[PDB]
Amino acid sequence: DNMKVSVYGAGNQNLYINKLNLPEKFGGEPPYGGSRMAIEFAEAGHDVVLAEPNKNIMSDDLWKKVEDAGVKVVSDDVEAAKHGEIHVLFTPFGKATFRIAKTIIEHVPENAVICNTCTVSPVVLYYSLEPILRTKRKDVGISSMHPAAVPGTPQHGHYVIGGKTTDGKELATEEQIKKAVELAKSAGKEAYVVPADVSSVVADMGSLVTAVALSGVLDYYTVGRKIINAPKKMIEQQVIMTLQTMASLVETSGIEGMVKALNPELLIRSASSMKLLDRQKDLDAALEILQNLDETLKAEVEKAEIKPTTLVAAQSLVKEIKTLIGGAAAEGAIKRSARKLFEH
Amino acid sequence: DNMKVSVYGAGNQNLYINKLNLPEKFGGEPPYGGSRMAIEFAEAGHDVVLAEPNKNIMSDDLWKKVEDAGVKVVSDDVEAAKHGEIHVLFTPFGKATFRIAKTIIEHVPENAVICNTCTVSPVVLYYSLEPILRTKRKDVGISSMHPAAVPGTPQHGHYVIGGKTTDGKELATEEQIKKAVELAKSAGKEAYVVPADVSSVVADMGSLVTAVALSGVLDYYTVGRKIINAPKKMIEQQVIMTLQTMASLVETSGIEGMVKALNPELLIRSASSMKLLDRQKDLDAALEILQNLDETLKAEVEKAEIKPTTLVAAQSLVKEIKTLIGGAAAEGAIKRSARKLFEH
Ligand SMILES: C[C@@H]1Nc2nc(N)[nH]c(=O)c2N2CN(c3ccc(C[C@H](O)[C@H](O)[C@H](O)CO[C@H]4O[C@H](COP(=O)(O)O[C@@H](CCC(=O)O)C(=O)O)[C@@H](O)[C@H]4O)cc3)[C@H](C)[C@@H]12
Ligand SMILES: C[C@@H]1Nc2nc(N)[nH]c(=O)c2N2CN(c3ccc(C[C@H](O)[C@H](O)[C@H](O)CO[C@H]4O[C@H](COP(=O)(O)O[C@@H](CCC(=O)O)C(=O)O)[C@@H](O)[C@H]4O)cc3)[C@H](C)[C@@H]12
């Protein structure tokens, strides 16, 4: 099989080459990112169009690598939309990504699948398109194609594909997901389907936060259960509270407001009493980081406002709202509030 | 001051002394915990009653120390309830803490304040007593006096006292909070008033998780802003999604189910691509912890089921339901669902 593929966004080569210095710290050669995905798809035998309105995003020498792979470059998103069975958004954060999705949705061929990469959760992308998806384009699927690294670097060995959500919702058909998986595999990459509501947390840049937070949770779980012999329910409740409270404070007050609310000084004193083993290098690392915060950050923390934040049991609250106003209205509330934070 | 003080629970001296070996691992001398708080309050000149139904919870020699400090020991919670203006729950996790609170609430004097320590959040404690607090005992306040260390150890130098919530709820009066603060200070401890909805996250056992997750958030924030120059709102959105998704997964599926959903292997690969700096010892510690997981933990993770979990924007959803069903009904929903997770 070979497919018609559309990739949207060449990727910021100045970022990859000069900011991240990928060629020398990670490996490979430019171009990286979206234009590299297109190259790899074309070398896999696919019929590839790359949509990039900004010709200045890379030198002619790098554009040439793209053209030699057999990628057809267009400046018009709509032309790319009519071309592909599968559409890969390597698009700039924010309005650009949502704008491009909304631009192409009424032009993509029957049964097309639209996949986000780094820039947005597929559930959020789905929500932003839901009024069209539920009416005029019930054929179109939403998935994702998250690289494990920057495409073009040696470290990129797989894709995470957003599949059926943990609560059983299908954003794309099984056939559309299998086409996404086969597009990944055809490039010599591993391809893993992950529930779409979880996928961006394990593959986006914030996976940094996921890994470090998870390491603290497992540290506390181990120490709690094996040293302290704390009840498992107690440990889990405190974990939920910590993560939920931090999430909510960032949502209302930003990073600096959340730090102001938790108070690192206090936190360091308190967490110090949880040093039961020297095997806890995560706690060791955290304590030194919190004691040496960048100086401009601390100034902005003092200036920050802690906004009204409500303590909740989030999944329990979802169930409660369903019992009060019904499944349909509850889902409407969940969708509107998700779009307000993650889309605008 | 000659404040009337009631403390509930002597503390598990077998755990502190014989299991954890605090005298040699931390310092100080037994007794520790609730009975030590009682001793310190009594030595500060307060009129202290300690309620402990189980005389076998410490040796006779340790009881003599409590008694020589002038602490009056009673086995009946109701008698201690009638005594104190301030009531300190050093009570076993779960039904015990809630049971003792419900036992004393209808017997405590006019204007008394009831304070949790390690075992429960003051907001949850308030929710569990709310049916009585709203009607018969609108005079009674709820606060906390969390030692953020084990009382009796050198590390215990302060108390975290839960004050007005970030969203403006006063669970105790200014006069009741001032008593908790003076009780702390008269005992030589510093006293930090912190919004009650945040207090346990900064002082509980789970402060280990708070400190480690926060260091990961600040790591990502620094790398995001200063290396990648990612939009601040993108970074904050990803932090929120990560922390929320983890909280929600633990809530529906337990720690092992959450681990199964996030998939350590994928996470490790992805987070490795975010290793941009030698400054990131939090990320370093995390990668070694996750890649060297206990084999019985890894077995229990694969056996775990991932339960239906709903992607939400929690604070946005709270605002959404307040407008949808009104402030009073939304607060009822938040109260009932919080109790369902954290009390029942
Ligand atoms: C090294 C990392 N490792 C990973 N590791 C893992 N595991 N997963 C990953 O995804 C990554 N990475 C993905 N990476 C990654 C992903 C996103 C961005 C974000 C970009 O650096 C950009 O900051 C955003 O995409 C937004 O930039 C975008 O901003 C403009 C849109 O504004 P606009 O012009 O539409 O708005 C107007 C409004 C003006 C008004 O208010 O009127 C304007 O400002 O003019 C776009 O043109 C582009 O510049 C950076 C790096 C890293 C390369 C990479
Ligand atoms: C070293 C740590 N550093 C800190 N550092 C910081 N920053 N913050 C902290 O809070 C702490 N710590 C607080 N710590 C801490 C706090 C709670 C627990 C957990 C408690 O130990 C739990 O409350 C017990 O595990 C409950 O279970 C204990 O009680 C059971 C009896 O059955 P039951 O509870 O069902 O019986 C009822 C009787 C009902 C009746 O009386 O009718 C009851 O609850 O009494 C016992 O078998 C034992 O497992 C452990 C350690 C650590 C010592 C300490």
Q: What is the CATH number of the domain that holds A239?
A: 1.20.120.1300
CB A314 within 8 A of CB A244: yes
CB within 8 Å of A190: residues ≥ 6 apart = A157, A158, A159, A184
Is B317 part of a structural domain of the chain?
no
Phi, psi of B162 (to 5 degrees): -75, 120
Nearest Cα residue to atom 54 of ligand 1: A150
Residues A151 and A268 in one domain: no
How is residue A135 annotated by DSSP? T
Does ligand 1 come within 6 angstroms of the Cβ of A52? no
Q: B240 contacts in A (CB within 8 Å)?
A: 247, 250-251, 341
From the candidates A159, A194, A214, which should be mutated to test the interface with B, based on the most B CB atoms within 10 A?
Answer: A214
Q: For residue B294, give both structure tokens.
A: 């206990």
Which technique was used to obtain these atomic coordinates?
X-ray
Residues B53 and B199 in one domain: yes
Q: CATH no. for residue B109? A: 3.40.50.720
Question: What is the rounded CA–CA span in Å between residue B322 and residue B320?
Answer: 6
> B32: CA distance to ligand 1 center in Å?
53
List the domain range (segments joined by +) for residue B99: 1-204
Is B334 part of a structural domain of the chain?
no
From the candidates B226, B241, B300, which should be mutated to test the interface with A, based on the most A CB atoms within 10 A?
Answer: B241
Is A275 part of a structural domain of the chain?
yes
Residues B186 and B302 in one domain: no
Helix or strand holding residue B192 (H, E): strand B190-195
Q: B204 contacts in A (CB within 8 Å)?
A: 238, 241
Q: What is chain B's percent helix, strand, coil content, to nearest 5?
A: 55, 10, 35
CB A272 within 8 A of CB A287: yes
- Boundary (domain end) residue, out of B163, B189, B204: B204
Picking from A312, A343, A165, A202, the residue whose alpha carbon sits closest to that of residue B310 is A165
> A230: CA distance to ligand 2 center in Å?
7
- Boundary (domain end) residue, out of B151, B169, B204: B204
How is residue B146 annotated by DSSP? B
DSSP helix/strand/coil, A296: helix
Name the closest ligand to CA A206: 1
Ligand 1 closest atom vs CA B230: 23
Phi, psi of B53 (to 5 degrees): -70, -20
Pairing verdict, β A72-74 and A47-51: parallel
CB B128 within 8 A of CB B101: yes
Residues B166 and B194 in one domain: yes
Q: Give whole-number Cα distances, A336 to A171, A193, A328, B4, B80, in Å.
A: 17, 27, 12, 51, 50
Instruction: Give the residue, out of B118, B202, B208, B212, with the most ligand 2 atoms within 8 A of its beta carbon, to mutate for a pocket test.
Output: B118
Across the interface, of B94, B220, B338, the residue whose CB is closest to A312 is: B338
Residues B228 and B142 in one domain: no
Does ligand 1 come within 6 angstroms of the Cβ of A232? no
Whether residue A209 and residue B217 make contact (CB cut-off 8 A), yes or no, is yes
Whether residue B243 and residue A246 make contact (CB cut-off 8 A), yes or no, is yes
Ligand 1 closest atom vs CA A203: 7
Whether residue B286 and residue A259 make contact (CB cut-off 8 A), yes or no, is no
Across the interface, of B160, B282, B309, the residue whose CB is closest to A167 is: B309
Pairing verdict, β A146-147 and A158-163: antiparallel
Q: Give whole-number Cα distances, B272 to A121, A145, A210, B265, B276, in Å.
A: 20, 18, 12, 11, 9
Across the interface, of A201, A268, A308, the residue whose CB is closest to B241 is: A201
Picking from A101, A111, A54, A112, the residue whose alpha carbon sits closest to that of residue A78 is A101
Does ligand 2 come within 6 angstroms of the Cβ of B204? yes
Domain count, chain B: 2
Q: B121 contacts in A (CB within 8 Å)?
A: 241, 311
Residues B182 and B290 in one domain: no
Q: A230 contacts in B (CB within 8 Å)?
A: 93, 205
Does ligand 1 come within 6 angstroms of the Cβ of A205? yes
> B61: CA distance to ligand 2 center in Å?
22
Q: For residue A16, give both structure tokens.
A: 């990859």
Is A330 part of a structural domain of the chain?
no
Whether residue A319 and residue B337 make contact (CB cut-off 8 A), yes or no, is yes
Residues A187 and A80 in one domain: yes
In order, the DSSP letters of A201-232 are HHHSTTHHHHHHHHHHHHHHHHIIIIII---H
Is B58 part of a structural domain of the chain?
yes
Whether residue A240 and residue B341 make contact (CB cut-off 8 A), yes or no, is yes
Instruction: Give the residue, out of A91, A97, A100, A150, with the most ligand 1 atoms within 8 A of its beta carbon, to mutate for a pocket test.
Output: A150
Q: For residue A183, give both structure tokens.
A: 């597009």
Token pair 């049991």 is at which residue?
A: A313
Residues B193 and B229 in one domain: no
From the candidates A238, A242, A292, which should be mutated to test the interface with B, based on the most B CB atoms within 10 A?
Answer: A242
Token pair 């996928």 is at which residue?
A: A199
The single-letter code of the amino acid at B176 is: Q
Length of chain B (residues) = 344
Triad A307, A309, A313: Cα angle to 5°? 165
Resolution of the determined structure in angstroms stands at 1.9
Residues A197 and A211 in one domain: no
Q: What is chain A's percent helix, strand, coil content, to nearest 5?
A: 55, 10, 30
Phi, psi of A18 (to 5 degrees): -100, -35
- Boundary (domain end) residue, out of B204, B236, B265: B204
Q: B33 contacts in A (CB within 8 Å)?
A: none
Name the closest ligand to CA B17: 2
Residues B162 and B45 in one domain: yes
Residues B261 and B147 in one domain: no
CB A161 within 8 A of CB A177: yes
Q: How many helices (H) and strands (E) does chain A have?
A: 16, 9
Picking from B237, B60, B33, the residue whose alpha carbon sits closest to that of residue B149 is B33
Q: For residue B335, give both structure tokens.
A: 């109260």
Residues A236 and A177 in one domain: no
- Rounded to the nearest angstrom, the gap between the alpha carbon of residue B262 and the centroid of all alpha carbons in its chain is 26
Strand residue runs (E) in B68-131: 72-74, 86-89, 113-116
In order, the DSSP letters of B231-279 are -HHHHHHHHHHHHHHHHHHHHHHHHHHHHHHH-HHHHHHHHHTT---TT
CB A149 within 8 A of CB A180: no
Across the interface, of B227, B229, B251, the residue whose CB is closest to A240 is: B251
Is B70 part of a structural domain of the chain?
yes
> B186: CA distance to ligand 1 center in Å?
54
Whether residue A241 and residue B121 make contact (CB cut-off 8 A), yes or no, is yes
CB within 8 Å of B301: residues ≥ 6 apart = B256, B259, B260
CB A176 within 8 A of CB A182: no
Is A316 part of a structural domain of the chain?
no
Ligand 2 closest atom vs CA B26: 1
Q: B288 contacts in A (CB within 8 Å)?
A: 281
Instruction: Give the residue, out of B32, B54, B89, B93, with the most ligand 2 atoms within 8 A of its beta carbon, to mutate for a pocket test.
Output: B93
Question: What is the rounded CA–CA span in Å between residue A75 and residue A56?
Answer: 12
Nearest Cα residue to atom 44 of ligand 2: B96
How is residue A17 annotated by DSSP? I
Q: Give how far A157 is from chain B: nearest CA, Å.
A: 9
Question: What is the rounded CA–CA span in Å between residue B210 and residue B123?
Answer: 18
Is A341 part of a structural domain of the chain?
no
Picking from B290, B240, B295, the residue whose alpha carbon sits closest to that of residue B263 is B290
CA torsion, ordered B120, B175, A271, A254, to nearest 10 deg = 90
Instruction: Give the residue, out of B8, B12, B20, B32, with the most ligand 2 atoms within 8 A of its beta carbon, to mutate for a pocket test.
Output: B12
Does ligand 2 come within 6 angstroms of the Cβ of B244? no
Token pair 């329990």 is at which residue?
A: A316
Does ligand 1 come within 6 angstroms of the Cβ of A206? no
